[PDB]
Amino acid sequence: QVQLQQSGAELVMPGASVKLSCKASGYTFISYWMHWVKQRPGQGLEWIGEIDPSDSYTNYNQKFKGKARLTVDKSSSTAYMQLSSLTSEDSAVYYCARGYYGSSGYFDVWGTGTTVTVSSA
Amino acid sequence: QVQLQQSGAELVMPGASVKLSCKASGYTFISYWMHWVKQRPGQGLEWIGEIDPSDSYTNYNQKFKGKARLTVDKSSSTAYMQLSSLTSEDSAVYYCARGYYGSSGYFDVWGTGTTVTVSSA
Amino acid sequence: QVQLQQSGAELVMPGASVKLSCKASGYTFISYWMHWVKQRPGQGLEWIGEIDPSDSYTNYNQKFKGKARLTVDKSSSTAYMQLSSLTSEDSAVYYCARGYYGSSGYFDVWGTGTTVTVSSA
Amino acid sequence: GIFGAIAGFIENGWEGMVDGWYGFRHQNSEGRGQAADLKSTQAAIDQINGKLNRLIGKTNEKFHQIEKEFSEVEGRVQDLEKYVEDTKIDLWSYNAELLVALENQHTIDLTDSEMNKLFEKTKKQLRENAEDMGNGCFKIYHKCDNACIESIRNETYDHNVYRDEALN
Amino acid sequence: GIFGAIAGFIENGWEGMVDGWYGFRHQNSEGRGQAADLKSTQAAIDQINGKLNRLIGKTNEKFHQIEKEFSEVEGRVQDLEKYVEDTKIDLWSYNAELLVALENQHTIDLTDSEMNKLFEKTKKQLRENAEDMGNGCFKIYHKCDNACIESIRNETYDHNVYRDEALN
Amino acid sequence: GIFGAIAGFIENGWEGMVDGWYGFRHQNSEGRGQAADLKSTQAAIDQINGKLNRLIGKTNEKFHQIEKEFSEVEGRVQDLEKYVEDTKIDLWSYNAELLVALENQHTIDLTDSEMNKLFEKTKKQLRENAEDMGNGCFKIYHKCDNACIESIRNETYDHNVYRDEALN
Amino acid sequence: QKIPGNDNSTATLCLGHHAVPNGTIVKTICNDRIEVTNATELVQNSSIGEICDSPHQILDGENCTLIDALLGDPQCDGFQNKKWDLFVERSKAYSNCYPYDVPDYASLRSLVASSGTLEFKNESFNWTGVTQNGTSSACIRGSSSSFFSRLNWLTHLNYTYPALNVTMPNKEQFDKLYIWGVHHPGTDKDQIFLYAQSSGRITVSTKRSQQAVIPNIGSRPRIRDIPSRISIYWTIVKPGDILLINSTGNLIAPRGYFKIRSGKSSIMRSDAPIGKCKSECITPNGSIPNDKPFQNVNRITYGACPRYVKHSTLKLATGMRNVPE
Amino acid sequence: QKIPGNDNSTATLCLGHHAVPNGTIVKTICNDRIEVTNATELVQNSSIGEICDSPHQILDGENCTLIDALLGDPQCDGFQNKKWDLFVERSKAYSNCYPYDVPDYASLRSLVASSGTLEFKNESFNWTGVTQNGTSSACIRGSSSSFFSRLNWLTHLNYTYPALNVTMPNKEQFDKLYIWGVHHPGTDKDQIFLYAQSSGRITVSTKRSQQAVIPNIGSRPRIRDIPSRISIYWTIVKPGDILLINSTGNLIAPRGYFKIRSGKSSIMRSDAPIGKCKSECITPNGSIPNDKPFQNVNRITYGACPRYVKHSTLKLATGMRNVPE
Ligand SMILES: *[C@@H]1O[C@H](CO)[C@@H](O)[C@H](O)[C@H]1NC(C)=O
Ligand SMILES: *[C@@H]1O[C@H](CO)[C@@H](O)[C@H](O)[C@H]1NC(C)=O
Ligand SMILES: *[C@@H]1O[C@H](CO)[C@@H](O)[C@H](O)[C@H]1NC(C)=O
Ligand SMILES: *[C@@H]1O[C@H](CO)[C@@H](O)[C@H](O)[C@H]1NC(C)=O
C-alpha cells in the first residue's frame, strides 16, 4: 500500500524552527517526486515546492524563498521540511503529497497532514 | 494493359490556342513520367518537354519556351499540352509518351498521335 | 608447426654489406609483426627494429638509423635485413622473432639465429 | 540482433512512466518534466497484441485424441502410443521453449533503438549550434521552453538555427 | 529487429523502378532522375534465392507412408494413425506458419536501412559544407552534376569538401 | 537483421584474435598497436555459452523407446512404427537445421556493429576539431598518446576538445 | 538518467525510454535469467479444480464408466438415451453384475467416445426359441437382480437353443453401431446346462466384413461372486450394408442398435465434481481457462485447450527489458 | 520522397528505395496483414486435376483393386506381371469375383505398396490328390467362370482331400512372398461337399515363424450371389528359410511366389485418369508441381512432394515491405 506516513502536531515559538517528516513506503522513492501543500484553516490549498528524490532538484514557490526548504533521505525513504522564521500567519496543516515527474505534477497519492500551530501562549 | 489514350484531330486558326489531352491508364500516374514528342510529316521526331506527375516539375526544350506548356490532372490520370501563338510550322503529329524517371528517360509506352493542322483554309 | 627458419653463418669484410633471411612458415605472414633481436657474445639482448608485413610500416631503434634496413617478401613469407658500414663491433647472433601487433610486442615465436662475423682475417 | 540502447546508453531509466512504454524526459528553465510518445508505445503494444493473437485465445479445437494416461502393460501398441505421445510432448515442449526464446529475444530487439528518428529530427537545427549530441541525453542547444518539447513530441518541429554559438 | 526506414523515413518510395530492388534518386541541376543499385539489390535477391533453395525444390522423397484416409472405423489402431497423422500435420502446419512468420520478418528486417554505407561515404565530404542530412533524403551540399551521382552510386568518390560559404 | 560492419566496412580485420573476439587498433607517433575489448568479447562469449547451455549437455534423458532398426516385414504397426520414427527424425532434422540456421544468423547479427558505443564516446571529442569517419578505419583527430587510447579502451574519457581549429 | 545542472546556461534538454521497479525473470535464446517489465505466464500452472460444463454438455460420472453406460449398468439407469459432448469417468467407478472383458476395450472405449451420442433405438428382432430377458444374480436394480438394459441375455428355451439366423438391414441413412457379446462361463457343465449343448460357435458378419468368435470356458477369479467373464464386440454397419447375427452357442445379443455419428465428443478420466463457468477446455484436474497457449496441467484434454508441454514457467516477454535500479 | 525544388548550390539527392503499386498481403510474427511488393505462394492451392505418368511408372487401376491385382481379378488380368512405381486404385473400385476379405487388408496393401514390383514366378509344386484350377461363379473371364488365376482353388479329388505337406525351399537370393488363402464356406455341408470331411486346419510355417488359421463357417450376407468369404494371408520368406504349406482343409494355395523389392513404390486411392506431363509428385486430386514447399491439395502423397499443411495461403515475403502510394 502506497501511504505517506506523516508525523504528529508541533507547537513552537514565533521565529523558531521546526522540521517535519513524511515517510514514503510501498513504492520506489526515486521514481516519483515529492510535493508539499499548505492549507490554512478556512483558506485554499497552496503549493510551496517540489523535490526530486533521485538527485535533489529544488524548485520553490516565488512567495516562499528563504522560508521553506526541501531535503530527502534516500536511505530511509523520507522527505523532510525545515521551516524558518515562523510567524502567527504560518499556522496551517501541511500535506505531504506524492507527485508525477516534473511539470505535469498530478499528485496521485496524498498524505494526512500535521497541525502546525504558532503561538506564544 | 497500359495504353495512353489520345484525342482526335484539331484544326484551329493561326495564332489561336489548342489544348491537347492524353489519358493514361493501366498504371499509377505519379510513378512514371509523361513525355510529349513532336513529329513533323517526313521529318524526325522532336522532344518537347518532360513533367513529373507527382508534383508538376517541368523541364522544357530550349526551342520550346512559351510555345508548349505541360499540365496534369492527377484525379483522372491525364496530361495536357497548351499551345500558344500557333503557326503553320507547328503542324505535326504530337505523340504523348511514357518514360522512366528523369534524365534516363526511355519512353517505354508511346501514344497514337494527334494530327494538328494550322491553316486559314 | 610455426618455425622461423634462417640461413647459415656468413663472414664479411669490414665495411661490406650482408643481407640476412628469415622465412616465416606455418602462419599467415601479414598477421603478426616481424622483429629482429641481436645478442652480442656474452652480452644482453638488443631490439633492432619492427616491421609490418601487411604494408611495410617500419620503426627502428634510435641507435640503428642507417645501419639496419628491414624488408619483406609477401609471396614467399620471409623477412630480410640489410647491413651497411659493418665493423668488428657488429659481430653477434641475430635472432628473427615474431610478435603481437604494434607496441605490445611480445615475441611469441623466436628464431634459431645466424652467426655474423666481421673480420679481415 | 540487439541494438544496445535499453541495456546500453539508456543505463537506468525512470520508473514513473505509467501512461506509456517510452517517453521524452527533459530539463527546462521552467521545470524538468517528462513525456510519453504515444506513437512508439502504441506500435509496441500493437505488435505485442499481434504476437498474442496467435497465442492468447484462438487455439486448436482438438476434441478426441489417444489415451495418454495408462495402466498395467498390454502390448507393443501401448509402447507405441506412449512413444508417440512422448515425442509429441517433447517436440511441443522444445517448440514452446523455442517460441518463447525467439519471441522474447525479438521483443527485446524491437523494443530497442528507433530513437534515431529523434536524432534525424533534431539534426538540422542541432547541426550548427555547438554541433552534434548523441550520448543518450540530447543536449539540445536550442534555447526553448515546453512548447519546443511539445513540438518534438508532436513531430512538428521546424529548424530555427541558433547561430549565436557556431563553435563554442 | 526492425530498422525503421522503409516503414519509417522512406514514406512511400517510387514505383517507376524496374531495374532492381533498391534505389538512388537525385535532383541535379541537369534534371532529376533515378537509378537502381547494383550490389545491394543483388544481395537481397541472392538471399531470397538462398531462402528459396531449401524451399523451392529439395523436397524429401517420401515414397511409402501410412494410409491417411479411412472409410470404416476400427478403433485403437485406426485412431492412433489418425492421431499421429493429425499431430504431424499440426506440427508441420505450425512449422510452416512459424517459418513464414520468421523469414517474412527477417525479409522485412534485412531489406531495411543499409543507407549507412551511403551515409559514411558522403560523410567526410559533407562535414564542412553546411553539415549533413540524416534521412533518406540527403541534402548533399556538394554542388555536383550527374557524374557526381555516378560516383555516389559507383562506390568510387573522392572527397572534395567545400571550404567556404558554408554554415551561413 | 544484419548490421553491415563485419561484411560491410570491416573489409579485412586483423588476425590477432588470441586474447579477445573484438579489437582496438590504432595509429600513433609512438608506434601502432592492438588490444581487445574485454567487455565486448566477454559479452559475446556469454551469449555463445548461453546458446550452448541449452545445447552442449543437458540432453533429454530418454531411456526406453520403440524399436527403430527393423527386420523382415510384418505388415501393420511396423509400418506405423517406421512412419512415426521417420516423421520424428524428419521433424527433428528440420528442427536441427532450422535451429542451426537461426542461431548462426543470430550469432552473425549479434557479433556485429557496436561501434556506436565508441562512436558516441568519440562524437563529443570530434564534434569541434575535424569530424568523425566511418569508412573502414575510425579517424580520431584528438592528438594524444597511448594513455588517451587507453582511456578510450577503459571507457573513461574526458572529452578534451582542441578548440584551436574548426575544420581546417 | 543523470541530467545536467539546473542553470545549463539555459540551453539544454534530454531523453530516455523506460523503467519499472517490479522485475520478472524470463528466458531468451541468449540468456536464461533476463529480467523484463511485464510477462504473461503462457503455461497454465494451476486449474480451478472442478469440471464446469457450460459450453460443452458434460455427462456425469457417479460410480459408472462409459462402457458401463453402454452396457447399461444397473447402477446407472439414468444415463440411457443421453447425448453428451464430454464424458468424465470417476476414479471411484466400479463395474457391476458380470465383469465384462472387452478384448479390445480401449478401441471400443475410443469408438463410443468419438460417437458421443447415445440413442439406443430399441430395434425389434427375431429371437425365436430363446429365453431372452434373463436375470443374473450379481446385478442390483431395485433389489430385483435385472440384467443389462442396453443388451440381451439369451439362453436355452425348453432345453433347446436353435442356431439363430436373424438379420436387420440398414434401411436408414446413418451408421448403426451394434453392441453384442459372447459369454465365457466358469464350467463346461455351466455351458451345457445354461446356454446350449456342448460348445458354442458365433459369427457376426456384415456385407463388407465379418467378425467371428468361439467362446472360451475357464475358471476365472471371482468378482462379486461371479466365476465368469463376458466379452463385448461391436459391428459398425454402413448404410445399405446388412448385419447378420449368426450364432449357435453363447450369444449376448443386443436389444437394438446404438446410433453413431461423426461428432466431436471424447471420454475423460477424472474425479472433479460439476460446476459453472464459461470455459470450453476440460482437464482431469478440472477446467482451465484457455486464455493461454500452453499448459502444464495434464496430458489429456478436451475441446479448445492449450497444448500440453513439459515446462512449467514459460513466461513470454509481453513487456520489454527491465532496468529497475 | 518529397524533393524541395530547383536548387543550384545544393543537391537534394533523396536516395530512397523501391515501391510497387500492387500489393500482396503476407503474415509476419508481429502483424498478420502486412503488405509486401512481391510474394511467392508457398502452398500449392490447386492442382491440374490429372495424373501424369511420364517421370514415374504410374499403373492405372480402372476397375482394379491392388489386392485383387495380386489375385486373379478377371477385370484386371491385363495388368499381370506389371512393374509399377505408383498404383492408383480407382474410386469406382468394382471387383467382380468371390468376395475376398483379408483380415489384415491394410497391412497387405501397405506391404505390396512398399514392394511395388509384381513378378509372379509360376512355381511348380507337390499338390497330389487335389483338384487344382477350380471354377468360380463371379469371376467373369471368357464366359467360362474360372477362379483367380493366381490362387489355386484346391478341393477334393476322387472324394478325398489328403493332408497336404508341400514345401519349396528359398534357394535363391531374394525374398519370396507367398500369397495364400483360407476359404470360409457358408454351411458345414458346403465345406463337406467341396473341400474335405468335417472342418479344416491350416498351419503355414516358415523356419523362423509360423502362421496357423482355422476357417470359420457361417452364413454371410450374399455379395453377387455368394454366401461365403475368402480370407487371404501372406508368408514373407527370407533367403535360406523354408516355407512349408501344411494344410488339412480349406487351402487356397499360391501358384507361385511374388517377387518383392524394397523400392520406391506406393499405393494411392484416387479417381483422376492418366495423362502426360513432367511432374514427380502425385496426389489423389492429381499431379501437382513440385516447386512448392507446402501444399493444401491432400494428405496422401507419393514421391518428391510438398508437405501437407492445414493452411491455404502462406505467401512468402519474396520482396520488401510495400508502401504503394
Ligand atoms: C565506375 O566504376 C567502375 C568499376 O566499378 C569503373 O569503370 C570506374 O571506377 C567508374 N566508371 C566511370 C565511368 O566513372
Ligand atoms: C470398367 O471401367 C470402364 C471405364 O474404365 C467402365 O466404363 C466400365 O463400366 C467398368 N466395368 C464395369 C463392369 O463397371
Ligand atoms: C512332389 O511331391 C510328391 C509327394 O510329396 C511326389 O510324389 C512328386 O513326385 C513330387 N513332384 C515331383 C515333380 O517330383
Ligand atoms: C492349372 O492352370 C495353370 C495355368 O493357369 C496351368 O499351368 C496348370 O497346368 C493347370 N493345372 C491343372 C491340373 O489343370
UniProtKB/TrEMBL annotation, chains D, E, F:
It is found in: Host apical cell membrane; Virion membrane. It comes from the Viruses. Glycans are attached at residue 154. Belongs to the influenza viruses hemagglutinin family. Homotrimer of disulfide-linked HA1-HA2. Disulfide bonds join 144-148. In natural infection, inactive HA is matured into HA1 and HA2 outside the cell by one or more trypsin-like, arginine-specific endoprotease secreted by the bronchial epithelial cells. One identified protease that may be involved in this process is secreted in lungs by club cells. Binds to sialic acid-containing receptors on the cell surface, bringing about the attachment of the virus particle to the cell. This attachment induces virion internalization either through clathrin-dependent endocytosis or through clathrin- and caveolin-independent pathway. Plays a major role in the determination of host range restriction and virulence. Class I viral fusion protein. Responsible for penetration of the virus into the cell cytoplasm by mediating the fusion of the membrane of the endocytosed virus particle with the endosomal membrane. Binds to sialic acid-containing receptors on the cell surface, bringing about the attachment of the virus particle to the cell. This attachment induces virion internalization of about two third of the virus particles through clathrin-dependent endocytosis and about one third through a clathrin- and caveolin-independent pathway. Plays a major role in the determination of host range restriction and virulence. Class I viral fusion protein. This is Hemagglutinin. The chain holds residues 346 to 513 of 566 of the full protein. The gene is HA.
From TrEMBL, chains G, H:
The keyword Transport does not apply. This is Hemagglutinin. It is a single-pass type I membrane protein. It is found in: Host apical cell membrane; Virion membrane. One of its GO terms (biological process) is fusion of virus membrane with host plasma membrane. One of its GO terms (molecular function) is host cell surface receptor binding. Binds to sialic acid-containing receptors on the cell surface, bringing about the attachment of the virus particle to the cell. This attachment induces virion internalization of about two third of the virus particles through clathrin-dependent endocytosis and about one third through a clathrin- and caveolin-independent pathway. Plays a major role in the determination of host range restriction and virulence. Class I viral fusion protein. Keywords: Clathrin- and caveolin-independent endocytosis of virus by host, Clathrin-mediated endocytosis of virus by host, Disulfide bond, Fusion of virus membrane with host endosomal membrane, Fusion of virus membrane with host membrane, Glycoprotein, Hemagglutinin, Host cell membrane, Host membrane, Host-virus interaction, Lipoprotein, Membrane, Palmitate, Transmembrane, Transmembrane helix, Viral attachment to host cell, Viral envelope protein, Viral penetration into host cytoplasm, Virion, Virus endocytosis by host, Virus entry into host cell. The chain holds residues 17 to 341 of 563 of the full protein. Glycans are attached at residues 63, 126, 133. Belongs to the influenza viruses hemagglutinin family. Homotrimer of disulfide-linked HA1-HA2. It comes from Influenza A virus. The gene is HA. GO terms for cellular component: host cell plasma membrane; viral envelope; virion membrane. Disulfide bonds join 52-277, 64-76, 97-139, 281-305. The keyword Disulfide bond applies.
